[PDB]
Amino acid sequence: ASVATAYLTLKADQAQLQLTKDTLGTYQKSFDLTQRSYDVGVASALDLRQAQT
Amino acid sequence: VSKQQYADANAAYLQSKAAVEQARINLRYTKVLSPISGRIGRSAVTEGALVT
Numbered sequence: 001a002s003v004a005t006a007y008l009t010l011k012a013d014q015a016q017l018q019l020t021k022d023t024l025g026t027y028q029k030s031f032d033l034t035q036r037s038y039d040v041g042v043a044s045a046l047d048l049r050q051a052q053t
Numbered sequence: 054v055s056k057q058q059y060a061d062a063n064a065a066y067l068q069s070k071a072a073v074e075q076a077r078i079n080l081r082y083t084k085v086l087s088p089i090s091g092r093i094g095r096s097a098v099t100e101g102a103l104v105t
Contacts, residue, residue, distance in 0.1 A: 041056035 034051035037043040087093075098104065 038055075044055040044058070 031051045034043060034048055038045070038048045
């Protein structure tokens with residue numbers, strides 16, 4: 001039972017890692033669009049800092 | 054602030070500065086100034102008359 005528990009825990013945490021790796025890319029694309037919108041002059045630094053955080 | 058917000062604020066400020074000049078024109082019209090320099094005749098209207 002301990003071996004099966006640890007194997008299922010690893011199987012779950014790898015999927016968690018992949019899904020967080022997708023969420024990070026989504027946040028990175030949103031930051032790139034906010035940086036473009038700030039470099040053209042439509043957004044301010046207050047939105048750029050939130051997209052950075 | 055962004056540059057577009059400053060452009061909007063500058064546009065609104067300049068529109069108000071033109072509206073107050075539009076008011077100053079009509080305020081300058083109530084003191085009817087002589088358009089040219091010359092000899093003035095007699096006044097066809099007196100004090101208390103309504104003009105249009």
